[PDB]
Amino acid sequence: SIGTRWAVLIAGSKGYHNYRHQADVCHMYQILRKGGVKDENIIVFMYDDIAYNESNPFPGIIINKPGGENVYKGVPKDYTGEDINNVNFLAAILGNKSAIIGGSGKVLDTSPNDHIFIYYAXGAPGKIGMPSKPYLYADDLVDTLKQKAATGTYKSMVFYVEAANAGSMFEGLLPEGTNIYAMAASNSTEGSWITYCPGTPDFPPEFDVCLGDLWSITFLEDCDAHNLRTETVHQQFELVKKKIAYASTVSQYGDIPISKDSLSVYMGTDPANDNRTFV
Ligand SMILES: *[C@@H]1O[C@H](CO[C@@H]2O[C@@H](C)[C@@H](O)[C@@H](O)[C@@H]2O)[C@@H](O)[C@H](O)[C@H]1NC(C)=O
Ligand SMILES: *[C@@H]1O[C@H](CO)[C@@H](O)[C@H](O)[C@H]1NC(C)=O
Ligand SMILES: *[C@@H]1O[C@H](CO)[C@@H](O)[C@H](O)[C@H]1NC(C)=O
């Protein structure tokens, strides 16, 4: 069978100054929606304190680029507030609705021919953030991926991580023979760069916070610019790695042959870009 495309999108932070992590994740949702991925198969973890924040100059709107579209519109709210935590994130990956404690109960209850795309935005050596402690440590995330692999409930999985030291979540830990490929904004010893901040030329005067993260907006704007049936994960890896080489080293881990897949295997493609063949 062709299977179904599923995704987990998670912004691991809270607070209006962290606008960018929720904007990054809402942008990824818009790409999946335009690609034909269904809401029932997209699990969203976002604190939800940005859109109607008294500090937002545009209530109900979240943008991930100056003059960009409203990426908040229609985004599902599976886990918001303090329901974003290691217990719910790991149970959602595993697909066990009986292990969720608070939230909508939407989980990756996948079948062997399904594809999974996971995107996290919001890091330190060996761990990534949750809105409140405890943070998510490398071993606990990788052990959850090993449990998922042992169930055999997926064809292949692609995991994208936007965080400082992102590569430390997988380096020397992520198995290479279980059809899981991971791409990280930075390697184990590097920080990550924020972008679309106030001060840069032609920036809107209403904002006092950064609208995105450099690696995230580089791969997200690439997804928006091409027919994703003509671009592989490997082609995106090479393009984004070269594009932000001055800021961080884009790194890959796990089952590298999985990146031979076209991005559309995970994300679909927007018909508006059908003529935009990748070169
Ligand atoms: C799915 O999860 C069920 C419930 O797990 C129990 O409750 C959660 C909240 C944790 O406290 C966990 O440690 C408990 O065991 C399990 O009973 C069930 O076996 C799981 N199903 C599968 C197929 O793994
Ligand atoms: C708005 O953002 C501030 C950050 O200063 C946060 O403390 C507050 O809880 C947020 N409020 C709402 C209603 O989202
Ligand atoms: C991580 O990137 C730095 C450059 O920022 C490089 O010097 C270092 O060798 C890299 N580490 C690994 C394990 O590749």
Side-chain angles (χ1 to χ4, degrees), residues 96 98-99 101:
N96 190 336
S98 303
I101 296 160

Side-chain angles (χ1 to χ4, degrees), residues 130-234:
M130 286 287 163
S132 295
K133 279 191 282 180
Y135 272 22
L136 182 60
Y137 289 69
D139 288 352
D140 294 316
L141 174 61
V142 174
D143 290 346
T144 295
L145 299 178
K146 296 177 165 177
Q147 292 177 278
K148 185 64 162 179
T151 73
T153 58
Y154 67 92
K155 179 64 120 293
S156 67
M157 178 190 292
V158 165
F159 204 140
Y160 273 25
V161 181
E162 169 75 67
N165 311 88
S168 70
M169 298 297 291
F170 305 117
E171 188 188 27
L173 304 165
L174 189 63
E176 303 177 43
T178 63
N179 299 336
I180 303 172
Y181 169 84
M183 200 188 305
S186 53
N187 80 7
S188 305
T189 60
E190 281 176 330
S192 281
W193 276 46
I194 61 184
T195 203
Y196 295 150
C197 297
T200 69
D202 306 356
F203 190 80
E206 295 97 345
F207 289 100
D208 68 342
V209 294
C210 303
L211 306 177
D213 289 275
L214 185 65
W215 178 69
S216 293
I217 67 87
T218 303
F219 92 77
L220 297 159
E221 297 169 11
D222 184 53
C223 292
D224 289 330
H226 302 292
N227 177 337
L228 304 186
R229 295 163 61 79
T230 70
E231 182 179 3
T232 71
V233 175
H234 171 71

Side-chain angles (χ1 to χ4, degrees), residues 74-106:
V75 182
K77 298 175 187 196
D78 292 297
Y79 303 89
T80 67
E82 296 296 330
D83 293 327
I84 299 167
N85 54 54
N86 297 339
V87 173
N88 289 339
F89 179 49
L90 301 181
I93 292 174
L94 236 40
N96 190 336
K97 195 184 291 97
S98 303
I100 289 291
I101 296 160
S104 76
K106 195 191 293 156

Side-chain angles (χ1 to χ4, degrees), residues 15-16 49 52-54:
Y16 185 75
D49 55 347
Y52 305 100
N53 200 274
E54 303 75 9

